[PDB]
Amino acid sequence: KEMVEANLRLVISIAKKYTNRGLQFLDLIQEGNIGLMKAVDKFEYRRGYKFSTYATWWIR
DNA sequence: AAAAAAAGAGTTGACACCCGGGCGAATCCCTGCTATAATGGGAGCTGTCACGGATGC
């Protein structure tokens, strides 16, 4: 929960690009939060040492 | 003065067929997985009053 709350503002930058496509802003933010919470479960010390590099794919 | 049959019924086999139910095969929907660094948002009035009511000290 702490890790998903620390990177909560990262999804707002990705959700801003997708707009006026049939979904409101809050719904897109909630979907991005779902994706981020689903991506935080699997994160090891792989080639990508930044959590954002692995979370952006799941959020998108 | 008499007396039997084309229809009218009644069937009996003989196809023609027409969707139904399976056997296939070919092909749709779902779901998840991608590893360099991405880190707070874009309209909208604002050129009608007037009434009738709801908060505040």
Key features of this structure:
DNA-binding; transcription; 4 helices; mainly alpha; 1 chains; 60 residues; RNA polymerase sigma factor RpoD; transcription activator
Q: What can you tell me about this protein's structure?
A:
This protein is mainly α. 62% of the residues lie in helices and 0% in strands. The protein has helices spanning 2-6, 10-17, 25-39, 51-59. The structure holds one DNA strand of 57 nucleotides. The PDB classes it as transcription. The entry lists the keywords transcription activator, transcription.
In short:
Belongs to the sigma-70 factor family. RpoD/SigA subfamily. The chain has 60 residues and is mostly helical.
Produce the secondary structure layout.
Elements: H1 2-6, H2 10-17, H3 25-39, H4 51-59
Helix pairs in contact: 2-3, 3-4
The chain binds one DNA strand of 57 nucleotides through residues 7-14, 16, 19, 25, 46-50, 52-54, 56-58.
Region (Sigma-70 factor domain-2): 3-60
Subunit structure: Interacts transiently with the RNA polymerase catalytic core.
Domain RNA polymerase sigma-70: 27-40
